[PDB]
Amino acid sequence: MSYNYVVTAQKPTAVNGCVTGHFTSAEDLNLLIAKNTRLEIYVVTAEGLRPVKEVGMYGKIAVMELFRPKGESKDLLFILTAKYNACILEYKQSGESIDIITRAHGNVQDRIGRPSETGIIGIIDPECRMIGLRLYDGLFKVIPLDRDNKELKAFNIRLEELHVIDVKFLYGCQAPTICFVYQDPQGRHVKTYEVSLREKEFNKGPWKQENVEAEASMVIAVPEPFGGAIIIGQESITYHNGDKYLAIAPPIIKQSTIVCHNRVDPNGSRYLLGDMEGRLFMLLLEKEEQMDGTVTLKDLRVELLGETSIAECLTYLDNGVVFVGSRLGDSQLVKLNVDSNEQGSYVVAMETFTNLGPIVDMCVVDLERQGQGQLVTCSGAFKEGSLRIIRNGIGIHEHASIDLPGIKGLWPLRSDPNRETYDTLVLSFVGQTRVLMLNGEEVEETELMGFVDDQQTFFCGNVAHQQLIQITSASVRLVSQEPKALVSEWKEPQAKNISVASCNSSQVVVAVGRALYYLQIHPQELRQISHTEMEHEVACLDITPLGDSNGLSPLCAIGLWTDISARILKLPSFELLHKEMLGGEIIPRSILMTTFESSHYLLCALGDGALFYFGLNIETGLLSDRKKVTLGTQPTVLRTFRSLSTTNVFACSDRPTVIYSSNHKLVFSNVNLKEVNYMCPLNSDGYPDSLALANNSTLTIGTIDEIQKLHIRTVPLYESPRKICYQEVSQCFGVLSSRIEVQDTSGGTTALRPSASTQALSSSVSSSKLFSSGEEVEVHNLLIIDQHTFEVLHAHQFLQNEYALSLVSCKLGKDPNTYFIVGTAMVYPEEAEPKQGRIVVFQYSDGKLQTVAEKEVKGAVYSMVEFNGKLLASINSTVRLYEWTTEKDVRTECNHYNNIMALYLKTKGDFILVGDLMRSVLLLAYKPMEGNFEEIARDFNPNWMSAVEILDDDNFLGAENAFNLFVCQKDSAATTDEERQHLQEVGLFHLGEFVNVFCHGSLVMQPTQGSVLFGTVNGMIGLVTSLSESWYNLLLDMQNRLNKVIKSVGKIEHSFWRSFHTERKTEPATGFIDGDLIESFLDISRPKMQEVVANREATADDLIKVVEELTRIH
């Protein structure tokens, strides 16, 4: 009985694969980017990427190829998952609706077979007769492609070559032929086979098995005009066809392994190659020919083009542009040019796409001492290495702050016709209007002719033809720029009050109840036009001359009072078109029409807090999409502000929201304010682009960040960070980091590019003498990072061949000082289980790093949490507990040795600890008895752990290596010295990700219990919470209902997907829910949703609310 919830906080950002072709249309260039469990679909444009579709799958995409057989309009997509789910996908659009379809599927795992070295490789023959796969050593799996075979059924063929490296289907082959580099004892060899389904055997290929180099590793098959295979080694590259053999050994490739190729030119005259380094090569097939007779290949060469982010994926797109698929660092768009500018790099970066990288460690914050956590992560590796601060929501920067418990609206007035700046703020008040002539940045409250000061203003626009406007309770006044007095002033013919305002800069519409008017500020006076009553009382009115209108404004939209409805109308007529009869006894407190990139929209906030958004047609004007969304428990006021181009809508509530503009959609990100009542743009000669905000009591004005739900700040490190600690008292982070450096002309090491550790403000090296007994080495550092500036305050360099591996920041013993302790490891390529290392105690002084204490140790200090005023530390197989003398030294009390390799420890305040490497997780207490360790319980499963966290006194979370999560707890059991000694895995789950780090923290706040964040190798941030048995059940059941109803892309059983699974065991998930699934709910049509309820109670949309309440834990 363990009960948990897991949700994505940020999807994986690492790019796992990518591919190009025409999957959208026969005449349209798509790039498909595979993240982990996400397919991204783009059209390549002149600008770059137009996003088209972002589907998920129930699987880690292992194979992604586009293909097209005979009689096929556009490229089908083949996908093999890691759990061996194969499928074939087709891009389908119903004019406005986009759907990816499953043309076939089948699971292709074989109960037999070991999964080979070098992983899954699927492939596809040029003629599209079939799909060849290599999953298992010895076996090659063949899947004929035929109109039928919708189940992708497949035979195996035996393969003498037990240890294949890479394989491709050769071009221009009468028979389906494959080409493969295999490795036996003798070396590595290229070989071929024709492939016949006719009789489920191979035959022989068109050419003798040749040889290839010891590190040979990529096969490339060159298209029809050339044929044959390009095979890429280390320090070398070669070509093969029948009798032809071409070779090259440019030293320029020697320094790093090529790692991806991609063809540029269909003929294959040109190819791109990427590197462990980021270097981008161009591999050219020197042209050549001999009259009537196909093109030969005289030669081939490498041209270093420059540098990219480290590339998993590479894909030439349109003209000179290349997408660089990165997993170790940020992905990017990148222009190649015939000319190499400064530095001599034909490769200029165009776009850079954020990868939260492999997140190697991370921590909450803890910055502007507010109450929300910023998450700070060590990311990337090598030169992509970085920190990334991640802050949920959109912040705003406050300049002035006038405490005003009234403000009931506010409007943006310039007092000088010329200047784009507004030096006045007129604001609705407690049945009043205060004016604010600002002396630039200074506040001062005075009169202003024709602008009533004893009247609750309800509007105040910037009306053209040199005039000002002030709609009050009473009369819709008018004031001049030339005269500046009472130019006009309207007044209802009966002495009746205006109930609801409206205006832009030329158009004027008021209402008095059910009544409607319409005025115009025609030079120096208000002339009326229409009048029309309505069913019920006018709740709200929107009008802004949208697209094809300059001041004068097309159609109209309205919310009424008894029937609680919102309805599309026109103008001088006032003719009712289509309408919606929204439910509820609560009135639409605000209606809005707008424009964005290329679309018009109708938005309606009610007073319950919830909202309805719909799309308007400047021409036609009718329905769109029914779907309400809760936000500010208090009526939402909607406005529109200055930002950039896509200028957007601000939602004022208890829960202030912005509404962005996604993939031509509209974002719904939180704003980091206490509350907002009303809000408007600005530009004073002393408060430029700022939106003034007003709450219960206070005016405020400032800029607005980007948008995207979440914001990400990035400290580029150039080297590869490893661990990281915040030491608040000293307002900085320590970060363990490593760079790499070469052996010199004798042994010394240089420093290719500058990194954070060499560009440091100050610096250090270890003096300590505790020891005494081309080539790449690592150099490791503690870094002091200013929390405010993210400057490398100080760098401490560690000893030759010493590894910092663990980092704490704590106070120790009675000692009222706070240290950065660092566990380390003396690492030589001779052994493989360090026998020496150290614990070092640092202090960071005024601007200073004082090596306070060191401690030799007889193994690698893997992890070390601060225990209980003492220092607990894992020292290779043996966990120890060090105390801090008064006389300032780390000295032992106890150790425990029942550890194959203690990699991870964590501490629930109490004298309780937990961890391990290949035999997943022990629990241990510390005994104020013989100040000792009593091993309370382990878990007797063979889990190769990666991360480990304590959720509560009983619950222990672990991540491991198949990408599985599992929870453990202590067995409440009779016979309490056995069933006791054994804790049971009472929650299992296949996550789909490698978890490096857990931590208690949350991204949110100023249903669920606890909040543990996680960072993955893929840049996914998850979150794990605990559950009441009842929510569990509600949700567990809901999980099942939800899956009968959702069309899982490639027809993959969700439950099959989430199934705890190693290559030696497969159990269904228990004690876990993907909120990711749960949340799938909301993206569902109401019909499909109603279905989900067939049966304390069971409703229909009480849940629509339950699910919302959760989306809000991250």
């Binding site: 360090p834 990666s946 290596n961 190798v1017």
Partner: peptide, 13 residues
């Protein structure tokens, strides 16, 4: 050594 092999893992393939 495991160290290296523990890195390579924390950082995928």
């Amino acid at each position: 050594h495991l160290l290296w092999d523990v890195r390579k893992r924390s950082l995928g393939l």
